[PDB]
């Protein structure tokens, strides 16, 4: 039945709406993974809609487009798998399979490197400390002071590693502060 | 019947995937409108899925959940309308109806104030200039230099107007640069 498939899609839409209204600004790592888990399954459920329209077609024009669009999503899904596994070879990090970007941000906080997805990987990376909590490029990494800021962070993408040097860190309003991460060398493979 | 709705959702996900993959990093203002246009219509189509399941009430357990779940997405859609029209009263700008946040960021660039949605509105706002192009909080605003950075930006939300002050601008690698906006006063409405 399509009625039960209608309810599944309604919960898929409802899940994101909750993630878009109540958990958008929130950057909890478990919550962020759940958002990435949802965005990953957005590719099979895009393919499932077109496969259902391809098999249970209305007209050959409608079914023919759904066959082409299922290949279009299928090609875009394999392009994610190709780019992520190529990224996974360089980094050996489980964040390489995030479905939003193929670039990783490595911040050495609390000793262990805190790898996070990075969207743009620009020349300058912004580090903001708020109430003693560091957030770099919209990733709430955790507790970190101005004096405890990582003196060097790296950004890893496919066939290129970008090392970033801490620039000028300015402390504002006590616990809060700001920092500058200008790229200084490129570790291209 | 009920198969054409499958094709509509398939293109809704296909548009979602393209915006989330191909044009995720791209910050063209017309494209950013399209992303906000798509996220706005995600509320009627979440309600449309649950109304369709509520109308097709073959079993009371599935239909009864869909009736209650359509109320949950129905109420939080009107919660968006209530929150945005309150924001529209204070700001009188068409960006108040963005479906991602109820907080607006006003950056005075090129004379006319550039108003953009702001997800966080924290104490410190980072302004990254890359290749002579300013991007504040992930919103690419346009051509700007370190010497041409706005000395004061404001962040307008409901019942609060937070004025931000240019802390210190650092120039890196020539055209690029970096500066921070620390809040210095609040215009409590």
């Amino acid at each position, epitope marked *: 039945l399509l009625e039960q498939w209608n309810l599944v899609i309604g919960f898929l839409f409802l899940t994101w709406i909750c993630l878009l209204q109540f958990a958008y600004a929130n950057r909890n790592r478990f919550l962020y993974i759940i958002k990435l888990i949802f965005l990953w399954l957005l590719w099979p459920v895009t393919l499932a809609c077109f496969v259902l329209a391809a098999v249970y077609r209305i007209n050959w024009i409608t079914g023919g487009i759904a066959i082409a669009m299922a290949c279009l999503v299928g090609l875009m899904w394999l392009s994610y798998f190709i780019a992520s596994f190529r990224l996974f070879a360089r980094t050996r990090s489980m964040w390489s399979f995030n479905p939003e970007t193929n670039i990783l941000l490595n911040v050495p906080l609390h000793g262990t490197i805190l790898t996070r997805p990075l969207l743009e990987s620009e*020349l300058v990376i912004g580090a903001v400390i708020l109430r003693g909590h560091l957030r770099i490029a919209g990733h709430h990494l955790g507790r970190c002071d101005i004096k405890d800021l990582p003196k*060097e962070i790296t950004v890893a993408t496919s066939r290129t590693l970008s090392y970033y040097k801490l620039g000028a860190s300015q402390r504002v309003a006590g616990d809060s502060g700001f920092a500058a991460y200008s*790229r*200084y060398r490129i*570790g291209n493979y | 019947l009920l198969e054409q709705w499958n094709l509509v959702i398939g293109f809704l996900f296909l548009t979602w995937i393209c915006l989330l993959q191909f044009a995720y990093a791209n910050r063209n203002r017309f494209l950013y409108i399209i992303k906000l246009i798509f996220l706005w219509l995600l509320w009627p189509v979440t309600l449309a899925c649950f109304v369709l399941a509520a109308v097709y009430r073959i079993n009371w357990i599935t239909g009864g959940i869909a009736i209650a779940m359509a109320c949950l997405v129905g109420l939080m859609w009107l919660s968006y309308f209530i929150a945005s029209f309150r924001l529209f009263a204070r700001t009188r700008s068409m960006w108040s109806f963005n479906p991602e946040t109820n907080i607006l960021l006003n950056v005075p660039l090129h004379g006319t104030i550039l108003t953009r949605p702001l997800l966080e509105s924290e104490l410190v706002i980072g302004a990254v200039i890359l290749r002579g192009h300013l991007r504040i909080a992930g919103h690419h605003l346009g051509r700007c230099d370190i010497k041409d950075l706005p000395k004061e930006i404001t962040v307008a939300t409901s019942r609060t107007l937070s004025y931000y002050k240019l802390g210190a601008s650092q120039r890196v690698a020539g055209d690029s640069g970096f500066a921070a906006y620390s809040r210095y006063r609040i215009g409590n409405y």
Partner: antibody
Amino acid sequence: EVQLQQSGPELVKPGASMKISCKTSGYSFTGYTMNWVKQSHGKNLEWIGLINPYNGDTSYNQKFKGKATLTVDKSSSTAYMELLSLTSEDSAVYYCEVINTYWGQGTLVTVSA
Amino acid sequence: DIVMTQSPASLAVSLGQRATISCKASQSIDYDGDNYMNWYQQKPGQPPKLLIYTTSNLESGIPARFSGSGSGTDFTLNIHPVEEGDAATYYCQQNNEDPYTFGGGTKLEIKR
């Protein structure tokens, strides 16, 4: 702040391997990549390679592949460079830096019999 | 492999003047429209001290008299005003492609 302490000078017979310890302090050892730079004849700065002490992947110079092997010791926060088959061309001062800003004092390696 | 050539081999300027140090890369190091040039200072008996990274950005704690210019292949280190403690050797390193080759280095001499 960030201090990198290296081993002292050692007179090494030709053809004998030598491991150069670069003890680090003032920061989380695994945090930042550890570069190695050779300064031959007191002027010719040459880049040997870098090792990421968190995971252990290295990136050598083409000339120093098979000559130097970079290793780390997370327990003692000490990064090692093990030079292989030392010759008279290896009589140099070897530095270990972090972000090119904080450097070790240099290990003057004298390869003579 | 990128070859860095520094001119002059030795530089001799007096105090308070401007010292111009060149560094001509064999190949263009423009990555994403930006050059990653590192300028070091090495007094005798001491490890090199990073002055300028990414061709213009001055290192923290370095006095604001070392300026890096140029893009593409020509790169310039300018010291103004020159003080007594600037008598050292200045190296340029391309931080773009493996290996990060250093320059030949020039021994700055104070004219007294």
